[PDB]
Amino acid sequence: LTGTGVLTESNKKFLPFQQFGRDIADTTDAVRDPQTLEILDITPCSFGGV
Amino acid sequence: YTMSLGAENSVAYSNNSIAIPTNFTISVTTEILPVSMTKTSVDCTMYICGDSTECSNLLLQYGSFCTQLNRALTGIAVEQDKNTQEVFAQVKQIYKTPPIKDFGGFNFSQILPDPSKPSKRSFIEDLLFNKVTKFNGLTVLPPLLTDEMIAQYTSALLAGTITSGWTFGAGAALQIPFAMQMAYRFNGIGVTQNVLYENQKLIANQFNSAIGKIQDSLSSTASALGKLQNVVNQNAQALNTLVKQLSSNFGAISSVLNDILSRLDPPEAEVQIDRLITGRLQSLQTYVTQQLIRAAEIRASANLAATKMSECVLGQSKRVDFCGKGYHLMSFPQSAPHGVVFLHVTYVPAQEKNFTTAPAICHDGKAHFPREGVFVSNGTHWFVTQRNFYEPQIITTDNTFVSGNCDVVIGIVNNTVYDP
Amino acid sequence: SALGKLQNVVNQNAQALNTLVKQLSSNFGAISSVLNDILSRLDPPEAEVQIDRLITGRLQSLQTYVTQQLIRAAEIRASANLAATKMSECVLGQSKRVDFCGKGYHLMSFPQSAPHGVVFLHVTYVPAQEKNFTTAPAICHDGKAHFPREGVFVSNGTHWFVTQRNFYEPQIITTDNTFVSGNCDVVIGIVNNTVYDP
């Protein structure tokens, strides 16, 4: 699962058997670590305009 | 069933019979119409090829398919501010009402701004605001005019209308008592000014009752603001469909560009990437065209708003049904989310009576016609009265003018004309 | 900078045509943006393959240009209708609509032509110098209440006059400027005075 962003620590939900978290688009919002068992949260970098 | 167009009615028409009202009724309507919509902005490169230099090497052979979308969106965004400015910035200075509200009995406390609230907004517009309810290169720019400036504009407009009549739109504001202004407004619809002075308390009570009933009509039923709500609904749906279009394969092996780039060799990745690019280009083009058409219609709505504010708030209007059903008296603007609200105060005739008329009257072989008004008869005597309100007077040589003789007019009658 | 409205129409058309011309220099996925270059190097079985992409790209460019032209033409038609209405009402007559033919009371207008446009010179009337006065809705004389016919009652401080509402021009109150209606115990704010009988 490639991609860039910031890995903030979020208690999104229990996720008893789930791994991925999705949004309106095909955007993985939260992912579960493969090594340990924690719920990380994906937030994209800063956008804007000049 | 089969729809019915209305209640059937047949008037009692005859060659000598008139109906003249003997009373009136002040009514306050409400007109809602949008002014501006949301200023959105989309970045083409970030939308199509998300932070992928391999995809950005492509989409460059297509030429200038990315700058035209930005130019059109910027044009729409700068058009919205012009719409709002031309709708609201009609006044040159910022007037304010005096601290003492001696307006002849009328009560404008419901529409005047409330100093107690942190935002200087009145009660009606607070009800209006309470009645009305991403990361893929899509941004929403903030409007140039914050809601406080709009409230200040509509407060200056109300203070000018109340304290100076229509004189603040032509030159400089000239103070005038509210009763005299209302007498001038009745004089502008063909009703003698003495009617207001003789029925001032009744007119004030009717106006207060109507302005109170407006609150009950608004704060209870929320179906009135649909014309303003559907604009937001349409924009939110268009944006949602644009976002939802990123989850489509368009014939490629995957709808996400990172799996394609991390799964296929460089020489044959462009085969899928070009199809993805084409699909997203078509989706952007359709969205841009729809936004252009919607903004084109919103501009016409805003032009109508500006014309109605100019001709209806800053002065009395003689155009029929332009400012509500009935004879127009005055209007009060109110701000609203992405729109404006008018409160048209109109004069509606009331209980009427049957009479008997005559085009002219023979006195000594001469034919007297009324200067202004109509000859009527209650059965025994003949009177002259104004056309919009029953007020009989004796027929003299100051109400009528002589022209011609009796052997030409069809329907002339006999009576005596008193000479003062 | 006064004629920006007419200058933007020209600039927008010029830039639209310029972009349409610039679109001729795009590969669109083929090996070259020149039909003759492709036609002098490849066999027709692959020449058709390399030409379909150019055909598609240029067709899409033409479609986009035509759509934008249609929208701009509709906007110009709306503006032209507004101009026709203004010519019908401000010039060929006198308009009572507020702020339609200029700020202030409208008197007359003169049309002047311009490149792809028209220019109006609205002549308007504007009041200049004001003065405070004391007013009264009516005057009770002999129990009767006299109301002004087409004027307003003013008072410089000692005497009372009737004047037109748009230009200070005081006159003596007589029975020719006022009309009688009812008695003088109903109106709020009536003022005692004497009405001269000529």
Added chain:
Amino acid sequence: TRAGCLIGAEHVNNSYECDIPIGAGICASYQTSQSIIAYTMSLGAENSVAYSNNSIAIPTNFTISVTTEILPVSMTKTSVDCTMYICG
């Protein structure tokens, strides 16, 4: 700013009829030691009218003014061939 952050312009506590809009009721202008300032736009000069129940103001003079209104009426008479453009 409520729209973003602006670097290179100095904030000013005054309020003028603004030249360059920015957003959320904030504008920028070039003024005097020359520099670019950013203030809160002023939407008009404050005024209060002396209203009372027996006072009226009547003009005693006038002035004639000639205004200008400029509006477009037609656009360029362009026509494009299709076959010669695509497959000339």
